[PDB]
């Protein structure tokens, strides 16, 4: 009921909002609002391995896809 827990995500620690774009960090498996971590929805299809700003420090920077599906 009203006292149920809800999952929270991102650096902002908010529950999910379907109107906002999010990307998963491949390392910590948390999810991040593009607006919170500087990733545009339209740029994300080019990201291969996404690492959040915290995970970057030990797991390395995000990588880009070397090939893409057109169509």
């Amino acid at each position: 009921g009203s006292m149920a827990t809800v999952p929270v995500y991102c650096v902002c620690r908010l529950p999910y909002d379907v109107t906002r774009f999010m990307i998963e960090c491949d390392a910590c498996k948390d999810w991040f609002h593009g607006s919170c971590v500087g990733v545009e929805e339209e740029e994300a299809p080019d990201i291969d391995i996404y690492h959040c700003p915290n995970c970057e420090k030990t797991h390395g920077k995000s990588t880009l896809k070397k090939k893409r599906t057109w169509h």
Partner: peptide, 6 residues
């Protein structure tokens, strides 16, 4: 990457 679209 895995994403959640709008």
């Amino acid at each position: 990457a895995r994403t959640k679209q709008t």
